[PDB]
Design an enzyme around this catalytic site. Structure first.
Site, short mmCIF file in Angstrom:
data_model
loop_
_atom_site.label_atom_id
_atom_site.label_comp_id
_atom_site.label_asym_id
_atom_site.label_seq_id
_atom_site.Cartn_x
_atom_site.Cartn_y
_atom_site.Cartn_z
N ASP A 1 -108.92 -96.48 18.57
CA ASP A 1 -107.85 -95.61 18.09
C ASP A 1 -106.46 -96.25 17.98
OD1 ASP A 1 -106.59 -93.13 17.41
OD2 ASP A 1 -106.30 -92.60 19.49
N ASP B 1 -104.19 -93.66 11.47
CA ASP B 1 -104.95 -93.25 12.65
C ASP B 1 -106.48 -93.45 12.58
OD1 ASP B 1 -105.42 -92.07 15.17
OD2 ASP B 1 -104.29 -90.24 14.78
#
Ligand SMILES: Cc1ccc(F)cc1Oc1c(C(=O)N2CCNCC2)c2ccnc(Cc3ccccc3)c2n1-c1ccccc1
Ligand SMILES: Cc1ccc(F)cc1Oc1c(C(=O)N2CCNCC2)c2ccnc(Cc3ccccc3)c2n1-c1ccccc1
Ligand SMILES: *[C@@H]1O[C@H](CO)[C@@H](O)[C@H](O)[C@H]1NC(C)=O
EC number: 3.4.23.15
Length: 340
Positions: free
Chosen positions: A38, A226
């Site tokens: 992430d 993201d």
């Protein structure tokens, strides 16, 4: 900064085009974990063996047992990690982590409080934060920063490839390259967009076009690139207008269109660094049928990210599947090239 002559790759599994996860090993002997990589967060965490079994997510996920590791170093500093969809709480511990052939001593979170929602829907056990130290909770050195310190990587960059398919298997679900890019998974050249600030993988977006006209983001907006986000997200007001233009309707946690109407939806273009990044309806509609009797979900949702990071759009797996992404730490920029 000290550079070497090596690159490391992490093979990813694609679960339903919504979850992309790899394996990491923790401790001596290694305890294996399914993890999401992430860019929207900076901490490493896995569920702990000390997580009370009344947390159903802890019964279903793989737990780290410090008592089974001979290379474990105690810390115990309390840590709470608040994400867009949930919160985890635990304590810091230190152990040897294996990532794509690379061995690194890392401080990570041992999660003792793991709520059922959203963790029971998660295929991954934990998270490997690919964000900057400035956004790391407890000032913990992120894993990539610790790999860079070894002086083995060719470049101070990392790249993401997310494949399509998911349903049929045999094919590579995705791939992360540490210290470079994989020319086999992209075509043409990278176009870079400089970060609006160091500390966050966020860039300026000049406009969002729905079909012909530039309907949204007139006079600019922010875009968070993201990797841990399944979809493309925007604020409630931005998405409300976008969905009105598409004829879509709100359904608790997503927007839906009649399945037969899916192929008729217009192109959605994102204006980033002077270049137009276009998604056709096949790239953003989960076409599960062509029936007028069924409702098909869209890979675009509303997410209100609060300040200092937000209000912001998030460019997740939906965007990455189309555009192979390079995260450049040395030059504080993000590169995009058409994925293959
Ligand atoms: C909790 C969490 C931490 C790190 C991470 F990579 C992902 C995380 O989970 C997150 C997100 C999310 O919270 N994000 C914030 C940080 N950056 C990635 C997106 C997140 C944001 C938007 N949509 C989903 C899809 C979703 C949302 C609710 C229920 C099911 C599916 C998200 N999931 C997620 C949760 C469970 C399984 C798969 C993904
Ligand atoms: C099962 C169910 C029936 C009636 C209802 F009102 C809601 C229902 O639950 C539904 C959905 C949902 O609304 N569905 C109806 C349409 N198709 C999928 C299920 C639904 C649709 C999409 N994602 C989630 C998962 C999710 C979870 C947290 C955050 C984001 C996303 C959903 N959940 C859900 C499942 C388990 C726990 C809580 C909710
Ligand atoms: C935990 O480790 C870090 C190393 O940076 C330090 O902040 C702290 O003193 C440690 N605490 C304990 C109890 O070992």
């Amino acid at each position: 900064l000290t550079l070497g002559n090596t690159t490391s790759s992490v093979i990813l599994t694609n679960y339903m085009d919504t979850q992309y996860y790899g394996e990491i090993g923790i401790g001596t002997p290694p305890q294996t974990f399914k993890v999401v990589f992430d860019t929207g967060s900076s901490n490493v965490w896995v569920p702990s063996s000390k997580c009370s079994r009344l947390y159903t997510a802890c019964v279903y996920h793989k737990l780290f047992d410090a008592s089974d590791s001979s290379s474990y170093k105690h810390n115990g500093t309390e840590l709470t990690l608040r994400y867009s969809t949930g919160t985890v709480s635990g304590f810091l511990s230190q152990d040897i982590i294996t990532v794509g052939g690379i061995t690194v001593t890392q401080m990570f979170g041992e999660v003792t409080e793991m709520p059922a929602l959203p963790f029971m829907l998660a295929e991954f056990d934990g998270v490997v934060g690919m964000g900057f130290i400035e956004q790391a909770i407890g000032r913990v050195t992120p894993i990539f920063d610790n790999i860079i310190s070894q002086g083995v990587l060719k470049e101070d960059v990392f790249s993401f490839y997310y494949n399509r398919d998911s349903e049929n298997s045999q094919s590579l679900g995705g791939q992360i390259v540490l210290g470079g890019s994989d020319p086999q998974h992209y075509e043409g050249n990278f176009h870079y967009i400089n970060l609006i600030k160091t500390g966050v993988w966020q860039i300026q977006m000049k406009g969002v076009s729905v079909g012909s006209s530039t309907l949204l983001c007139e006079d600019g907006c922010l875009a968070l690139v993201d990797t841990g986000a399944s979809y493309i997200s925007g604020s409630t007001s931005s998405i409300e207008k976008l969905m009105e233009a598409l004829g879509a309707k709100k359904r608790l946690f997503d927007y839906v269109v009649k399945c037969n109407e899916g192929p008729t939806l217009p192109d959605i273009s994102f204006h980033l660094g002077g270049k137009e990044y276009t998604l056709t309806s096949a790239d953003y509609v989960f076409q599960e049928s062509y029936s007028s009797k069924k409702l098909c979900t869209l890979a675009i949702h509303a997410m209100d990210i609060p300040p200092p990071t937000g209000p912001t759009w998030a460019l997740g797996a939906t965007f990455i599947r189309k555009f192979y992404t390079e995260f450049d730490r040395r030059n504080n920029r993000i590169g995009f090239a058409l994925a293959r």
